[PDB]
Symmetry: C6
Subunit: 219 residues, 6 copies
């Protein structure tokens, strides 16, 4: 992270506690949806230099890390098109390229200068965090064990259990379309078992989740 000592902004060492919590999250949860807000929280206040330490401390899951790296490169390339950089005049620090934001071609002090300079500050750490989020969302989709369309209530599975599996798989899609609404509720009802579906059909148009759970308790 960053700290202020005197009238200057200087690197603050990344906590080993934070670093270890990130490493444990990956080892234990293996790209469940919670990895996305997990990274956001644990990378809060970080420079790209700090973020790369977090990512490089992951010892396994290298296919997923490579996918993340590929998404970082796409966004880095897109950045260069949206913000081409004229050659720094008079020995002044350049404007950051995509690789600079990713921390591959920039130092910690350069990153801090862009982040905390008075005129036209660029939050390169927070931009890089956004790129990694997109990569992690691809990984959640990749590691999802059961696609939403294959979530079907078992003959004797409690309705509450089926609903848990349904919304977990729906969330694992990681898209704006895969959210609770009339269209996704239609699928939920459709893929319920015959006994529960018969009960759900009697609840009218667009019943609430609470109504559905109440009505199907014990069926």
């Amino acid at each position: 992270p960053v700290q202020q000592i005197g009238g200057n902004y200087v690197h603050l060492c990344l906590s080993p506690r934070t670093l270890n919590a990130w490493v444990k999250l990956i080892e234990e949860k293996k790209f469940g949806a919670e990895v996305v807000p997990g990274f956001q929280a644990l990378s809060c206040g970080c420079t790209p230099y700090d973020i790369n330490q977090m990512l490089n401390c992951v010892g396994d899951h290298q296919a997923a890390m490579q996918i993340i790296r590929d998404i970082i490169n796409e966004e880095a390339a897109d950045w260069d098109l949206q913000h081409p950089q004229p050659a720094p005049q008079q020995g002044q620090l350049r404007e950051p390229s995509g690789s600079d934001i990713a921390g591959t071609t920039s130092s910690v002090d350069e990153q801090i200068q862009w982040m905390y300079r008075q005129q036209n500050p660029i939050p390169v750490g927070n931009i890089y965090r956004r790129w990694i989020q997109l990569g992690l969302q691809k990984c959640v989709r990749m590691y999802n064990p059961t696609n939403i369309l294959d979530v079907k209530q078992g003959p004797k599975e409690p309705f509450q259990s089926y609903v848990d599996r349904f919304y977990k798989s729906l969330r694992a899609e990681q898209t704006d379309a895969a959210v609770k609404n009339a269209a996704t509720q239609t699928l939920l009802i459709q893929n319920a078992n015959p006994d529960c579906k018969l009960v759900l059909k009697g609840l009218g148009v667009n019943p609430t989740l609470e109504e559905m759970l109440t009505a199907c308790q014990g069926v």
Copy 2:
């Protein structure tokens, strides 16, 4: 959370310790009544941005999380009726809608501005915490294994044990009516076993819990 640096209020990163304690509470306790004060303590001093990280780090129990989301939307809609928002004049920050308080349509800095502005501060974090409490109370009711009306003392169950189960289920109702008083004490006596009920009938009108426990010890 929030911190003061100079004469400005700025985001303070949420502690990984706090975040992990919340995640563990859900995984281990699974919506027992203690989840309500647990959230209150662990979300103390938080902005809606921080609170959403807490809620989104929950990997399972998505039916319950959806119920919470539904209650948040109801309260968000109710807020818009009670406090409609005129269009911000002169490039000034708008007054917050329900979605702004929930952190879905607002940034961390907007949340902090509403919370710490001099004129007419709005504690959007604490309002959002109240909405989530209502959602968690619904979940406690949902996860309650034994309804209060089905708590009946076994033939040879110690009276103290039965009382523990009774007040645990009573509390799990999460209502103003489900509290120790003459009416709920009447049910407690009613659903005691024949041996203990005979002893309790001799203690007069409205005996104290201590009197009931003393009188029934060993029966």
Copy 3:
């Protein structure tokens, strides 16, 4: 707890560490005598708002929690008799009732005002802690497995072991009378086994614990 920021006293969030230590104490020790100083230490510097979070985070043992609640109400009622409260003149904060000290009818900021106001400060947090101590002492008596009068040395039980059990049960009474003195020492000797009692009778009037342990070692 409370903190000073500028010239104002404001709420300080309760540590999750402290909260978890309290919850673990109850789960693991189950109202052994150490629960009383345990609460005192862990509730140090707390407002009634903070204390209620501690108490409400207890998920089981609800008979005991209800006993505590009953003692709180008795002391709250007693407070209202000793300190009736005239109606606040001129929009000034009222003087606290029993329910205000218990945190049921007061906010955190009201509690802090009473605690840190210049004229006639009232330590409502420390008063409430005293009420809860009385409740916890009742619970220690309730959970005590062996009454002091039933602690009798076994035929071949080492004297040191018997003494441990005796003073543990004596302490579990939680009264001023149940303390080491000539009267309770008389019971200790009385309930020793024939072999140790014969040795203890030869030590004169009011022998010390060290003398008793030395004399009975190996008997």
Copy 4:
């Protein structure tokens, strides 16, 4: 402990970490010699109020705690003889009795006043810590499994092992006399086995421990 806020000395809450470490030390080590420096370290900077919380959080070993209490009373009585206290003139805080130093008849604020007053400060916390040390030393002797005089080298026990047991039991005496010197070394040699004793006799007068260990390696 104590802290300075403004120009005043005020109580600092005892850390739950410290308190728990003390409780665990007793439960796990059960009055081995290390309990004495352990208490000293963990009670560093404490008032008698804080120290009593530490001691009262011990749930078992009440014979030992009573022995400690008896030693505290002896030292408290001795204090009253060495420093009788005239009656406080003019509503000024009294000079502390033995019971005041022990924290039984004094509050935290009285303890802090004696500790940090300008004229004739009395470190009541550190005096009380000395009294408890004397009590803990008695307990180490009591819990010692093998008296020094019964530590004898086995027929085939390695000399290094025997030496470990010897100095552990010697230390457990907790006296000035029970220390490594010519007299205690004479006993060590005396209670070695015939094979090692023959080797030790050839090392001259007052051989060093290193010489003894070197000479007996493998015998």
Copy 5:
């Protein structure tokens, strides 16, 4: 590390937490690629004196530690050639040799002087960290269980699994050449099994990792 007290820079004790995390990393991960960023993070802000404590606390793996020591000596010798040091005039601190940067011939205070002196500061801690990184990279290669050229997809091994093993071994090379590009992708395809290779051949020139994983899912 270093701290400022008054107008002077003084040693800050290395945290036991950090030290223990380093020791555990070596014991548990045994020179997997993550040891390199792990050292970088855990040695952040350290002087050579602090770094040597970290390295010397490693109790096993002494062949690897000797390899690190050999690389340190090479870089130390190279430093002396690039920056020969004239004899300090007038009792002034010398310019640092290679052994001074390694902390073998310099004290903590000398290291801090070079690091924080106004004119021509030399970051000896960060230079030494670079030397150790080179040593750790050699160790990663040494401990790598499967050379990249021996990573071949099994008859029925899922393509995702094979890809994980491939990029883990590729990374374990620790060279600029061993990175995802057209040349290394050619090897990945080449060493896939007949069923997956047939599918991969139909994806055109330089297919993306995502395309390869999508195309081979379930083959």
Copy 6:
């Protein structure tokens, strides 16, 4: 440790965390070479008073602790010869003897005065740490399971494994002579098995460790 409050240097309580880490190091690692830098790190910034708490908290291994005590006494005696102390004139604090540096005849405040006095400060804590290091080095030699001269490669033991054992035993000597150089490398080659020795003989004069490991891989 020490802290500055106002214009005065005062004792800072030793952290229970640090103390516990030292105790665990001894219990778990039992005088492996890492105990030496371990003590150095964990005793950083300590007074002799603090160091004695660390050493006295060790409950077992008393032969080793006595060896340490014997080395402390030798160095203490040597100090008195090198720095005899004239009698303090005019009620001024004496110059420290060997026993004062060891903390046996001095208080914490005396130790701090010597450490932080303006004229002729004496770092008694750091001098004492040096004495204990010498004692711990003797203990490492004592606890070493396999003497360097008895480390011989097994018929089918991998060369890397043999090298680990060799350098671990070499280091356990704790002398300037027992370091990697031409002479100790000669022994390493000499005590390799016939198959590896034949390979090593072909590598010329003074081959590097890397060359030896590369050449012998799989033999």
